[PDB]
Design an enzyme around this catalytic site. Structure first.
Site, mmCIF file in Angstrom:
data_model
loop_
_atom_site.group_PDB
_atom_site.id
_atom_site.type_symbol
_atom_site.label_atom_id
_atom_site.label_comp_id
_atom_site.label_asym_id
_atom_site.label_seq_id
_atom_site.Cartn_x
_atom_site.Cartn_y
_atom_site.Cartn_z
ATOM 1 N N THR G 1 -53.776 22.337 -10.655
ATOM 2 C CA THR G 1 -54.017 21.011 -9.983
ATOM 3 C C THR G 1 -52.930 19.940 -10.148
ATOM 4 O O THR G 1 -52.300 19.832 -11.199
ATOM 5 C CB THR G 1 -55.298 20.420 -10.542
ATOM 6 N N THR G 2 -52.730 19.163 -9.084
ATOM 7 C CA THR G 2 -52.070 17.864 -9.164
ATOM 8 C C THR G 2 -52.934 16.817 -8.455
ATOM 9 O O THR G 2 -53.306 16.993 -7.293
ATOM 10 C CB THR G 2 -50.677 17.885 -8.513
ATOM 11 N N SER G 131 -51.869 20.035 -13.987
ATOM 12 C CA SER G 131 -50.740 20.878 -14.397
ATOM 13 C C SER G 131 -49.412 20.429 -13.787
ATOM 14 O O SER G 131 -48.354 20.651 -14.375
ATOM 15 C CB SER G 131 -51.001 22.345 -14.025
#
Ligand SMILES: *[C@@](C)(CO)[C@](*)(O)[C@H](CC(C)C)NC(=O)[C@H](Cc1ccccc1)NC(=O)[C@H](CC(C)C)NC(=O)[C@H](CCc1ccccc1)NC(=O)CN1CCOCC1
Lengths: 235, 244, 195, 240, 250, 243, 212, 231
Positions: G1-2, G131
């Site tokens: 994920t961002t 991440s």
């Protein structure tokens, strides 16, 4: 003395029957169901003029699609409303949908007989539960401390109930508009109330599919009172 | 079932009174009188023992006056056994506070908690209330010298001078007459004894029928001392004021 | 969390606490206030495990505020420090202990004296003229042993504190993004905005 | 555990234990609440059969629940301490979770809920206490005054009284209080509160307590001399 | 099922009396006479052995009981209630004191624990008070010899000498004439036997009388040697023969 | 007075009136019997046909415990079922721990102690049934009868219900006329006769017969119901004797 | 994920990617990582899908119960604290969550709170979580000003997710945009990285590391 | 009189008055009929309203695909007991993969009602139930009373004026028992049976309530326009 969960010789529970007498002493509450919506109205009945009437809260929201009015020992209703709101929101969490009006009423009525020697006595308050769902449409329910609930086209509860119910028997038909139902609740409330009906001592509300449950302002009700007086003088 | 035999100890009368609390107060009115007087430089506690026998051991005896900690004492009126239950709870409570904050417990905080226990027995549990009224005498660095009373209802109030037990009506009138605010300890000692001497149901007030205690700052510099009087010390103080 | 310092001078107690909050390889915030006012004349700074720190600080804050309302009276710094110590002493033998170290700075109004207490997560309490938690102490204690005097003013104490921060900024591995400084004295608690 | 149902219905639909708890309130010392344009005032009676009292240490009739809300009562004194303690704890709990102090309505609703719970729980009797709860909501300047009673019902009042001879002082307030124009200042609000208590009390010496609450946690209790000046002024205007 | 009696069976009456405690004291009045006298160098406690049947062996039924090596107890009232109180008293001396301090409790504190147990039967749910009054004699290093009475309410008082039960009114008067502060232990035994003869009707010998003292330490009754500090129990129960010897020079 | 209003209260006689009142509920019930025989026991019971609408053979009243014990009872039928449910739990915990099936005297006391426990407190009601029960174990055959007080004894023959006296008299004659013993098949026949003779005390509504038995030789030491040819043979034997 | 969200002159921008992974296996490219709690509240999701999805949904139910009981919409502070107090109870049990609670109320104004599974709760103007948070920070920080327009702010949020989607192996799929004003949240579309990358490369002239 | 304060007390003649008072609540309830053949089992029930503005109280409840009941008396007690049956039927299916026998269903209801008649504090159930079902031994009809007594029958009726329908079924026994493989005719007989309990009121479209279960028929309930066929 005697047990709390005792039967009478006629086959009725003493405590449940006695709680019904407490509800008769309560302030009047009326509900009418139509195809355009359901209307809920109540008598506020302030004990003294110094009491700020707008703090009297006898009509209450359970969810966006379900409303509720009360009559009797109104303090007892708080935990019932708390349970109803939790039941409604919990079902939405578990099933990603609105809960049926009937299923909500059944959940509230399950609390009723949970007393004995659980709480120490039955509830001393009756509830009018109004709402809408996709399956059965606009609905009105009368929930008692006996654990029983009936669906109604129209219903009154409280001190002026038997007189108001007879009037609802004559006035109700299956084609009533929402506006017609609003005036009819005001009319019948004005008849059974002790003090003269106005926007400060009476309160209206409704539930529609489109806009959901709404409590009316004192300004909006005041105009409906003025419209009602004019129509009765017009013939 | 067992419903048949339940006295219902925690209910209201039609007049809005608590039966068992009222009857417990009636019991206390037959107990030996206890007086507390608060002076500017100390506090006096005086109490009358219940009809004494000549073969009673007087010096190694304790009936009325109990020590809660180094700065607080109580005088008792009512059932002694009931009082000791409450006294041990109060003693423990004081030590809990000292353990927690490293400071001696303020008098009112101790009084409130003991009175809250009494209140509980009048609202729930279905048990009889404690048949005991206390006079609390103590000192702390916030309010200085303080007198309180509590009764079976769990209600407590503060006083300059007060009596509990028998003949409180007559005793309170006499204290209200002779008491003034600039009073010293030695004067308050004399008032306490003179009041018991006039309100007693006995023929004459003697050393063997009394319990006495003071709480002065009469130690050396800015510290409080608790004196529980010995028999011979009561004999001397009774002669010194001219009662015997 | 990381750097918390305390200095007691003649008439006040000064607390300095780092502004950085770091998780992984990212500095998430550079303006974090690692302190809570427990009462008008008592201040507590804190450092340790994430989550535990704020949860513990606010729990203590709530309890002291409850006491104040109940008695209409302010607890002494000594009394507050003892309450905090006992709570941490209970915690260390719990299923999951609070991993939080604290400094308590207060002004005792009855004694008219400033007081500084250092308490670690085990419940180890000491009263000190100057204190620190974590790796900070390995630089600041020796520095203060040299430059500290007991009769210093608040201004002298702030200059002494600048000397500590400068040393930490020179020799510490991590960037802690400066400090928030607060003073506790007879008039209560206030924050120095330009440091 | 003691289980007995003490609060139950009777044939006529009454709960006698709740109604007898109201009788205990009627026996209690009088307490009055009046709210003005920018303030609320709480007045309280103290009976004068008790001389040789120590007023420094004796429990006060008006209690702070938080820095911005106060609570007075009429009825059993010991019972009131339990409600006050629970209220104070809830006040700090609300600040902790919501990061904002309680509203006066919220605090009242909590206290009233506790009173109700004691009317249908086994092994307990109802509280012999009615309360007046007053204050100002956070960042708000509109005065608030609420009342509660043993049954658990609560409501808002422009002005209200409870306790012994409360029907007499309610009569006074009903004709002397104008909804269209409430007491504009602090002095006017205190005077009306003292006037109303003077209909019932006896002497205006150490029998009347007054506590003034203003916005933003501004609460102060008046002293004897300060109250006595109101008593002196009112009596001189009366002789007319 | 289950104990539904969670409420008090002893309550205040309108007059302020506690009925069940009063009625318990009435049961003590009906009980056989027992007494206790305190001397300078000891304490004596005595009572009559009322036999239920001549076929019954009265030796098996002990009215005078050892609580600690330096503390004994006698009663008047209901025997069964006494027996269980002795069991509880013996145990509480260990659990709440000896297992903490490594020594036996002083008389006043053991008495204080028994009094607590009796007070709880006056206030707890679903129980009646104990129908007995106790006389507890004992010795300890820092208080010396002492004698205590414990009533159904849980109240206790220290005495120089006293009596309880059937003929306690007359027996207390007799002890007032004879008691002084210079009495030796043997003189106190003599007065105890004289006081008891007045209340007893039938046979008056070592088999019908039960008597025990709290006096000097008894190394011979210890059961072992080697530890100088342990010198033996101060409680001793007088034998049938030892009583009859004192009844000749009466 | 008021001594009869609460269970477990002694009257001044030393009696527990609540138990005696429970006996009145047993006396009001239908008749049921038990006969001990050479190598086992037989049980029978009267079933009143209230209406034509009752399904014949399909309202079974006799109950089995474990695989070797039979139980019949008169009075409040639901109370009896509660007692048997307990019995089945008692037997199950015995066999679990000790392996062997529960002996009859051991089982008898398990019920006895349980019924007696319901006379010790005012928060429970005594049982409103008398239970006749028994079976075959390692020591042979045993027949027992248990009453509301918790009292039970061993029996040569046993009866209870509305027609208990008639059934007792008829049982006594069998004991006298057969000192050496009665066979299992004979005891089934006799059980029919005695129920029919005991029906004279309940003769408004006609009835349905129901028998069961345990025998070392005939049923191999297990509890079985009597049905079909053997049941009809026993009915005919009873019909011939009343006329 | 961002995931990111930042505060600015014209309110709050919220931007997320849409990838879900199980190790190196790309499980989904179309996951919704923003949760619409009410017309004025948003929640972002990073970490465990079930954990985030379940509890942030539980959070919405608790927020609805607040406005029923109190007749008033819940504050961003109180909403974020319900979640942070919940996860604190589970501390050590192994919950994996990095969330941001974003919304507007009258008393607070535009507000953002960071909340994670070890109990951390932080008010702030800018946060990036996941991440690929570092890749987003690099672009966002170097281009951020308070005085950005609504149009420019929306683009910077979009462009920052694109940066992380490109460099972080465990980020990608598409960009979901949100703008939060005084009137409530407004959705600004789903943007596939398949087309968006090349469109941005051509028009902006960036991404010269890639073979054009 | 003095012996009716609670269920734990026997009367001098051995009666349990609280149980008898519970039985009285059934008599006040609206009539409901049950009957069966060898292939099918039918329930018919007369529903009752508060007034013309209210709905009609539902009398019949489904327990499983093969079992259900009708009620007379306190409706909330029927909801508790039916919920217990639903759970028991379900336990049998999940644990043993077995449809619960109708006879065992009765035995379980008896034992649950009994426990409420022997302990202090509690009260008897104030409702009677007619249970129908089809299992491995064919069709079944059961009558439940809150005393604990459960009875298997060919046909029966409970509620106010239930004696009329009970007499009719006693006459018609030989006829309706042999109505095999014909659902509509077995219902017609049940509708004619309940008609013998009517006074001043007749069977209307929103008044009647029918339920059936059988060999190749799951437990289903008919209301509204679906019962217009049988008027
Ligand atoms: C970026 C994309 C990387 O972290 C984001 O952080 C997203 C967050 C959004 C989607 C909310 N995170 C994930 O995609 C997350 C990463 C992760 C994985 C495992 C634990 C914690 C975090 N992925 C998941 O949660 C995936 C979701 C997809 C549908 C597979 N789920 C799993 O990996 C599951 C359950 C994990 C788990 C948690 C707690 C206890 C037990 C298990 N695991 C599997 O499905 C197992 N595995 C998949 C491969 O095939 C064999 C079986």
């Amino acid at each position: 003395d005697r047990g709390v969960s005792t039967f009478s010789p006629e086959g009725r529970l003493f405590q449940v029957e006695y709680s019904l007498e407490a509800i008769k002493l309560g302030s009047t509450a009326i509900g009418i169901a139509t195809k355009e919506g359901v209307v809920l109205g109540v008598e506020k009945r302030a004990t003294s003029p110094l009491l700020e009437s707008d703090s009297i809260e006898k009509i209450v929201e359970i969810d966006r699609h379900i409303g509720c009015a009360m009559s009797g020992l109104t303090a007892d209703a708080r935990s019932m409303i708390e349970h109803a709101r939790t039941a409604a929101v919990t079902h939405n969490l578990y099933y990603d949908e609105d809960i049926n009006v009937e299923s909500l009423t059944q959940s509230v009525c399950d609390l009723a007989l949970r007393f004995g020697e659980l709480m120490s006595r039955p509830f001393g308050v009756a509830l009018l539960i109004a709402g809408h769902d996709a399956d059965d449409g606009y609905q009105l329910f009368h929930a008692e401390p006996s654990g029983t609930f009936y669906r109604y086209n129209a219903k009154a509860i409280g001190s002026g109930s038997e007189g108001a119910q007879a009037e609802l028997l004559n006035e109700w038909h299956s084609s009533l508009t929402l506006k017609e139902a609003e005036l009819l609740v005001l009319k019948i409330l004005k008849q059974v109330m002790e003090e003269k009906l106005d926007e400060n001592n009476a309160q209206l509300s409704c539930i529609t599919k489109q806009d959901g449950f709404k409590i009316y302002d004192n300004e909006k009700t005041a105009e409906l009172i003025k419209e009602l007086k004019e129509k009765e003088a017009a013939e | 079932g067992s419903r048949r035999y339940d006295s219902r100890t925690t209910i209201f009368s039609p007049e809005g009174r608590l039966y068992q609390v009222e009857y417990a107060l009636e019991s206390i009115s037959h107990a030996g009188t206890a007086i507390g007087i608060m002076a500017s430089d100390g506090i006096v506690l005086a109490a009358e023992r219940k009809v004494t026998s000549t073969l009673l051991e007087q010096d190694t005896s304790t009936e009325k006056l109990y020590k809660l900690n180094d700065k607080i004492a109580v005088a008792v009126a009512g059932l002694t056994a009931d009082a000791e239950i409450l006294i041990n709870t109060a003693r423990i409570h004081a030590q809990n506070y000292l353990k927690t904050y490293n400071e001696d417990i303020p008098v009112e905080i101790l009084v409130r908690r003991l009175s809250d226990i009494k209140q509980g027995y009048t609202q729930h549990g279905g048990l009889r209330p404690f048949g005991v009224s206390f006079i609390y005498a103590g000192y702390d660095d916030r309010y200085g010298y303080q007198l309180y009373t509590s009764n079976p209802s769990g209600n407590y109030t503060g006083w300059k001078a007060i009596s509990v037990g028998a003949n409180t009506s007559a005793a309170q009138t006499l204290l209200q007459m002779d008491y003034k605010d600039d009073m010293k300890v030695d004067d308050a000692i004399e008032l306490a004894l003179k009041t018991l001497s006039k309100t007693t149901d006995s023929s004459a007030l003697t050393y063997d029928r009394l319990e006495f205690a003071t709480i002065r700052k009469g130690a050396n510099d800015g510290e409080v001392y608790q004196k529980i009087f010995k028999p011979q010390e009561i004999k001397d103080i009774l002669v010194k004021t001219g009662i015997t | 969390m990381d750097i918390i310092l305390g200095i007691r001078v003649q008439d006040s107690v000064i607390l300095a606490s780092s502004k950085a909050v770091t998780r992984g390889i990212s500095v998430l915030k550079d303006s974090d206030d690692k302190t809570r006012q427990l009462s008008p004349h008592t201040l507590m700074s804190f450092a340790g495990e994430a989550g535990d720190t704020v949860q513990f600080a606010e729990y203590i804050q709530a309890n002291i505020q409850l006491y104040s309302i109940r008695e209409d009276y302010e607890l002494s710094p000594q009394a507050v420090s003892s309450f905090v110590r006992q709570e941490l002493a209970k915690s260390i033998r719990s299923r999951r202990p609070y991993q939080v170290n604290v400094l308590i700075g207060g002004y005792d109004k009855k004694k008219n004296k400033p007081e500084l207490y250092q308490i670690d997560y085990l419940g180890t309490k000491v009263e000190l003229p100057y204190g620190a938690h974590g790796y900070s102490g390995f630089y600041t204690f020796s520095l203060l042993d040299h430059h500290y005097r007991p009769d210093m003013t608040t201004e002298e104490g702030l200059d002494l504190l600048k000397l500590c921060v400068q040393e930490l900024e020179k020799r510490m591995p991590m960037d802690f993004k400066g400090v928030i400084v607060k003073i506790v004295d007879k008039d209560g608690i206030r924050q120095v905005d330009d440091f | 555990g003691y289980d007995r149902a003490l609060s139950i219905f009777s044939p006529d639909g009454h709960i006698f234990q709740v109604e007898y708890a109201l009788e205990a309130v009627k026996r209690g010392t009088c307490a009055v609440g009046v709210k003005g344009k920018n303030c609320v005032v709480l007045g309280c009676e103290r009976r004068s059969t008790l001389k040789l009292q120590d007023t420094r240490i004796t429990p006060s009739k008006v209690s702070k629940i938080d820095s911005h809300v106060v609570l007075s009562f009429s009825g059993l004194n010991a019972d009131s301490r339990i409600l006050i303690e629970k209220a104070r704890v809830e006040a700090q709990s609300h600040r902790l979770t919501l990061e904002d102090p309680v509203t006066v309505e919220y605090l009242t609703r909590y206290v009233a809920g506790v009173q109700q719970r004691y009317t249908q729980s086994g092994g307990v009797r109802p509280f012999g206490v009615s309360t007046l709860i007053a204050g100002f909501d956070p960042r708000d300047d509109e005065p608030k005054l609420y009342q509660t009673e043993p049954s658990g019902i609560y409501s808002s009042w422009s002005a209200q009284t409870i306790g012994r001879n409360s029907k007499t002082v309610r009569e006074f307030l009903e004709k002397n209080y104008d909804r269209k124009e409430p007491p504009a200042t602090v002095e006017e609000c205190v005077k009306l509160t003292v006037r109303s208590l003077l209909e019932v009390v006896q002497t205006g010496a150490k029998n009347i307590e007054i506590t003034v609450v203003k916005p933003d946690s501004d609460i102060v209790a008046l002293s004897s001399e300060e109250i006595n000046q109101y008593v002196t002024q009112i009596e001189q205007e009366k002789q007319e | 099922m289950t104990d539904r009696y969670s409420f008090s069976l002893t309550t205040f009456s309108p007059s302020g009396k506690l009925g069940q405690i009063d009625y318990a004291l009435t049961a003590v009045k009906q009980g056989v006479t027992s007494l206790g006298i305190k001397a300078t160098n000891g304490v004596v406690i005595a009572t009559e052995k009322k036999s239920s049947s001549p076929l019954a062996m009265s030796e098996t039924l002990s009215k005078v009981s050892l609580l600690t090596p330096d503390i004994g107890a006698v009663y008047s009232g209901m025997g069964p209630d006494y027996r269980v109180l002795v069991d509880k008293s013996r145990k509480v001396a260990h659990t709440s004191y000896k297992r903490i301090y490594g020594e036996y409790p002083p008389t006043k504190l053991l008495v204080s624990e028994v009094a607590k147990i009796m007070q709880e039967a006056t206030q707890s749910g679903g129980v009646r008070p104990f129908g007995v009054s106790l006389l507890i004699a004992g010795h300890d290093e820092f208080n010396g010899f002492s004698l205590y009475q414990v009533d159904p309410s849980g109240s206790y008082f220290p005495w120089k000498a006293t009596a309880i039960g059937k003929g306690s009114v007359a027996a207390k008067t007799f002890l007032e004439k004879r008691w002084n502060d210079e009495l030796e232990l043997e003189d106190a035994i003599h007065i105890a036997l004289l006081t008891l003869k007045e209340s007893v009707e039938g046979e008056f010998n070592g088999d019908t009388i039960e008597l025990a003292i709290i006096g000097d330490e008894n190394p011979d009754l210890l059961g072992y040697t080697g530890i100088p500090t342990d010198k033996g129990p101060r409680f001793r129960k007088l034998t049938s023969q030892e009583i009859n010897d004192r009844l000749e020079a009466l | 007075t008021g001594y009869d209003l609460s269970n477990s209260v002694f009257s001044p006689d030393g009696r527990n009136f609540q138990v005696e009142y429970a006996v009145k509920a047993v006396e009001n019930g239908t008749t049921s019997i038990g006969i001990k025989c050479n190598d086992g026991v037989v049980f029978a019971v009267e079933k009143l046909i209230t209406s034509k609408l009752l399904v014949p053979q399909k309202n079974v009243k006799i109950q089995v415990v474990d695989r070797h014990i039979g139980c019949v009872y008169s009075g409040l039928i639901p109370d009896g079922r509660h007692l048997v449910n307990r019995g089945r739990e008692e037997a199950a915990s015995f066999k679990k721990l000790y392996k062997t099936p529960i002996p009859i005297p051991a089982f008898a006391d398990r019920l006895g102690q349980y019924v007696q426990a319901h006379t010790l407190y005012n928060s429970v009601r005594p049982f409103g049934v008398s239970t006749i029960f028994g079976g075959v174990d390692k020591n042979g055959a045993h027949l027992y009868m248990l009453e509301p007080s918790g009292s039970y004894w061993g029996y040569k023959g046993a009866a209870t219900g509305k027609g208990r006296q008639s059934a007792k008299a008829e049982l006594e004659k069998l004991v006298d006329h057969h000192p050496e013993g009665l066979s299992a098949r004979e005891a089934v026949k006799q059980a029919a006769k005695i129920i029919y003779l005991a029906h004279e005390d309940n003769k408004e509504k006609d009835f349905e017969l129901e028998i069961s038995w345990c025998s070392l030789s005939e049923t191999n030491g297990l509890h079985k119901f009597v049905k079909g040819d053997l049941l009809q043979e026993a009915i005919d034997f009873a019909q011939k004797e009343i006329n | 994920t961002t995931t990111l969200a930042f505060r600015f002159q014209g309110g709050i921008i919220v931007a997320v990617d849409s990838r879900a992974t199980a190790g190196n296996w790309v499980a989904s490219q179309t996951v919704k990582k923003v949760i619409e709690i009410n017309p004025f509240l948003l929640g972002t999701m990073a970490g465990g899908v079930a954990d985030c999805q379940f509890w942030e949904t539980w959070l919405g139910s608790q927020c609805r119960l607040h406005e029923l009981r109190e007749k008033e919409r819940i504050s961003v502070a109180a909403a974020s604290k319900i979640l942070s107090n919940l996860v604190y109870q589970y501390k050590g049990a192994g919950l994996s969550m990095g969330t941001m609670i974003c919304g507007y109320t009258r008393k607070e104004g535009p507000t953002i709170y960071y909340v994670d599974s070890d109990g951390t709760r932080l008010k702030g103007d800018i946060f990036c979580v996941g991440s690929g948070q570092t890749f987003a920070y690099g672009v966002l920080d170097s281009n951020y000003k308070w005085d950005l327009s609504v149009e420019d702010a929306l683009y910077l949020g979009k462009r920052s997710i694109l940066a992380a989607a490109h460099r972080d192996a465990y980020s990608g799929g598409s960009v979901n945009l949100y703008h939060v004003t005084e009137d409530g949240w407004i959705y600004h579309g789903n943007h596939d990285v398949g087309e968006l990358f090349w469109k941005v490369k051509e028009e902006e002239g960036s991404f010269n590391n890639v073979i054009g | 009189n003095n012996y009716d304060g609670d269920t734990v007390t026997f009367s001098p003649t051995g009666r349990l008055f609280q149980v008898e008072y519970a039985l009285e609540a059934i008599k006040q309830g609206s009539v409901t009929v049950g009957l069966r053949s060898n292939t099918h089992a039918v329930l018919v029930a007369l529903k009752r309203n508060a007034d013309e503005l209210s709905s009609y109280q539902k009398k019949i409840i489904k327990c499983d695909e093969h079992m259900g009941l009708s009620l007379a008396g306190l409706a909330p007690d029927a909801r508790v007991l039916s919920n217990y049956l639903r759970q028991q039927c379900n336990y049998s299916s999940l644990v043993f993969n077995r449809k619960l026998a109708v006879e065992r269903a009765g035995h379980l209801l008896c034992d649950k009602a009994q426990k409420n008649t022997q302990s202090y504090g509690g009260r008897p159930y104030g409702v009677g139930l007619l249970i129908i079902g089809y299992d491995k031994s064919g069709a079944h009809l059961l009558e439940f009373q809150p005393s604990g007594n459960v009875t298997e029958l060919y046909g029966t009726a409970i509620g106010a004026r239930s004696q009329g329908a009970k007499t009719y079924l006693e006459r018609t026994l030989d006829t309706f028992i042999k109505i095999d493989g014909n659902p509509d005719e077995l219902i017609k007989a049940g509708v004619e049976a309940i008609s013998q309990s009517l006074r001043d009121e007749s069977l209307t479209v929103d008044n009647l309530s029918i339920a059936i279960v059988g060999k190749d028929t799951p437990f289903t309930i008919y209301d509204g326009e679906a019962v217009a066929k049988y008027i």
